[PDB]
From a paper:
The difficulties encountered in obtaining a sufficient quantity of pure protein in a reproducible manner for use in crystallization trials prompted us to redesign the tethered construct. The novelty of this construct lies in the presence of a thrombin cleavage site in the junction region between the PXRLBD and SRC-1 parts, where the –GGSGG– sequence has been replaced by –LVPRGS–. In order to assess the usefulness of the new construct and to verify that the new linker does not affect the process of crystallization, we determined the structure of the PXRLBD in complex with the reference ligand SR12813 with and without the SRC-1 peptide. The crystals of the SR12813–PXRLBD-Thb-SRC-1 complex, which have the symmetry of space group P212121 with two molecules per asymmetric unit, were grown at 4°C in MPD, whereas those of the SR12813–PXRLBD complex have the symmetry of space group P43212, with one molecule per asymmetric unit, and were obtained at room temperature in 2-propanol. Only the SRC-1 peptide region interacting with the PXRLBD is well defined. Similarly, the region preceding H2′ (more or less including residues 176–209), which is absent in all of the PXRLBD and PXRLBD-SRC-1 structures listed in Table 1, is no more clearly defined in the new model. A closer examination of the LBP revealed that the SR12813 ligand maintains its original orientation and specifically interacts with the protein. These interactions involve the formation of hydrogen bonds to the side chains of residues Ser247 and His407.
Numbering used by the authors: 141 to 176, 192 to 311, 315 to 432, 445 to 460
Write the structure that this text describes.
Amino acid sequence: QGLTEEQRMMIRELMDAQMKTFDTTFSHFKNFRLPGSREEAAKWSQVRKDLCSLKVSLQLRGEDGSVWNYKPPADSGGKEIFSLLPHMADMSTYMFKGIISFAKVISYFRDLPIEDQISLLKGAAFELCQLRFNTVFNAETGTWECGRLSYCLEDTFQQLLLEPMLKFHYMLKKLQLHEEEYVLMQAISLFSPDRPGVLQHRVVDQLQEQFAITLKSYIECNRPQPAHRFLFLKIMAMLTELRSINAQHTQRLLRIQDIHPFATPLMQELFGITSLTERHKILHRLLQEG
Ligand SMILES: CCOP(=O)(OCC)C(=Cc1cc(C(C)(C)C)c(O)c(C(C)(C)C)c1)P(=O)(OCC)OCC
């Protein structure tokens, strides 16, 4: 090990939260939906760009051994480019509920004021959701293996690595991180002091730095040097790149939502779709429960 006692216990708590709130087999993801003027033309034309490189087919395995596969329609210029968004809204909403439950287990997060707990969740939800997706992603077949469900990227590796979120998943997977390293990335992402609407900048910054040092010292003392000499800094680089991709994808959601509303109420709150506690009643209730 080689970490202080505060540090070994800090990981213990994160790992615990991860264990209690991450459904790696997706056993409990049920009841989800499946497919069955000049100003506005530029809006639709930008949504096509927003959606075209994020297309997956869907595989769904049945208890009996049957397989249902779904290939999405090719872009014919109409509403058909939205066929998977209701299913994704349910998958992402299921994921965020787990992220919220993740944060509340953590003493340092729980000790923060409700309004700051909200702001931290609004800024980190996509990021922590995508870090969790990374651990079920298979880079050899381009597939997120989510228990009975599978999402495969449709062939069209050099054109894929153009979309920043897809390059991220490949780069991150290549690093071969430990469970403990993934969960530490989550904390560092969660306790970001310069999220919109955070009040206790000083406190959150102190907590983040405390988590980064634990990740830095975890790597020093659990990896053969100087092979992984810069793994910590690589991870920090990808956290920063992940903060940027979050913003881009949040703006994508809003453009799509503008012309084809589909976001769940929890998503509406998380991403600013229309008092910080009074404008986020679902989050507040989700945070005030046990
Ligand atoms: C705020 C961001 O929205 P969002 O959370 O939820 C939308 C319903 C988000 C969800 C998402 C993104 C990806 C990419 C980007 C890695 C391809 C996925 O592979 C997956 C699955 C479920 C297939 C694992 C889900 P979006 O980035 O990608 C849609 C595939 O949606 C933004 C428009």
